[PDB]
Ligand binder design. Structure first.
Ligand SMILES: [Ca+2]
Ligand SMILES: [Ca+2]
Ligand SMILES: [Ca+2]
Ligand SMILES: [Ca+2]
Ligand SMILES: [Cl-]
Ligand SMILES: [Cs+]
Length: 357
């Protein structure tokens, strides 16, 4: 079926990249297909199955964006307001001039990629934010940032008068039916927690860290992520406000060369060449500041685009692609951090082989 297209491509991918195990979800009108391949843990050979939890790394940022968007829909968060309006401990800092929208689009004045070493907790984090000097013009330059999306998370939590994780669960994960999605894997599920494999073939698992929940900390199944994708594709039963919040995460906010930056989601007009997709996932886009032009004709979610997001940890590699015009989506989770180029190629070949591009 679909499996005759999908299975050979994932077998070849897993052999070429030496991926121990994968979980794949294909979302289409007429339904969602879940497929599991290989081993959750190379050392034990425990197979990947419906219960296997994968670290999704930066794919976690899509949930942070979705909660932020819901707070906005509920009228509790103004996306263009200074972040210091919701975190008054940052009054008088650069965050008087930086907005939640900036943070969701990585246009927060060059806010850096990583949490610095000297930041070890919430207090030292907030002290660091207060002292930090922008290095790029706010709203005119994109630097991919864990500090930024992390702060959007803090801002959102404050705007909703709740703690980030329980609030995320109550307002987003639960209404989406994402009951196998964890920030902290309980002891009772550790036997289902896949073991990562790093680039040297060594076992590895993500460590806790500041802003982990907000920026990279989710462990989940392909099926749970498929619920989020289904909602993005208008294929789920979700209340009006959450649907509105989800749709708003796909609004185009900045043109960044060939890429359009939405709320964490990144997209490209169709037809898109794989090279363009590759250039979105490399050094030039991820590790350098890129000029960003605000779309203030604020772009309505489009139906003629390739929408995507990568996510990695040291031992895991994930990729989501959505084609709203075809009402189809793809979630690929692996317990190996394998090259973004190969994620793009596999996704493209799958979607092309299914006739969706
Ligand atoms: Ca406003
Ligand atoms: Ca099990
Ligand atoms: Ca945490
Ligand atoms: Ca090739
Ligand atoms: Cl970090
Ligand atoms: Cs849960």
């Amino acid at each position: 079926q679909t499996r005759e297209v999908l299975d050979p491509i994932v077998a070849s991918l897993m052999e070429a990249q030496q991926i121990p195990g994968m979980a794949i979800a294909l979302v289409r009108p007429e339904g969602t297909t879940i497929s599991h391949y290989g081993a959750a843990d190379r050392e034990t050979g425990t197979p990947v199955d419906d219960d296997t939890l994968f670290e999704i790394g930066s794919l976690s940022k899509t949930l942070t964006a979705t909660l932020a968007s819901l707070a906005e829909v509920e009228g509790k968060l103004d996306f263009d307001a200074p972040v210091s309006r919701y975190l008054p401990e940052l009054e008088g800092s650069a965050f008087d001039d930086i907005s939640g929208l900036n943070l969701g689009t990585h246009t927060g004045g060059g806010l850096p990629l990583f949490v610095p070493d000297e930041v070890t907790d919430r207090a030292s984090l907030m002290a660091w934010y207060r002292e930090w000097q922008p290095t790029e013009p706010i709203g005119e330059s994109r630097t991919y940032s864990n500090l930024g999306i992390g702060l959007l998370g803090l801002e959102t939590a404050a705007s909703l008068d709740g703690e980030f994780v329980p609030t995320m669960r109550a307002k987003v994960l639960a209404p989406l039916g994402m009951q196998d999605t964890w920030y902290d894997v309980p002891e009772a599920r550790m036997a289902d927690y896949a073991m990562g494999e790093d680039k040297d073939g060594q076992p590895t698992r993500v460590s806790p860290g500041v802003l982990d929940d907000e920026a990279y900390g989710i462990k989940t199944t392909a099926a749970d992520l498929a619920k989020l994708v289904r909602a993005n594709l208008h294929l789920a039963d979700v209340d009006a406000e959450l649907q509105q919040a989800i749709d708003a995460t796909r609004q185009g906010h900045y043109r960044v060369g060939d890429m359009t930056q939405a709320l964490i989601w990144e997209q490209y007009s169709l037809p898109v060449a794989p090279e363009t997709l590759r250039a979105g996932q490399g050094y030039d886009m991820i590790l350098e500041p890129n000029a960003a032009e605000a779309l203030e004709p604020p772009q309505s979610p489009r139906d003629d685009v390739w929408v995507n997001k990568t996510g990695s940890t040291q031992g895991f590699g994930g990729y989501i692609v959505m084609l709203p015009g075809k009402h189809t989506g793809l979630v690929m989770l692996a317990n190996k951090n394998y090259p973004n180029d190969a994620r793009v190629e596999a996704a493209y070949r799958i979607l092309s082989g299914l006739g969706a591009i």
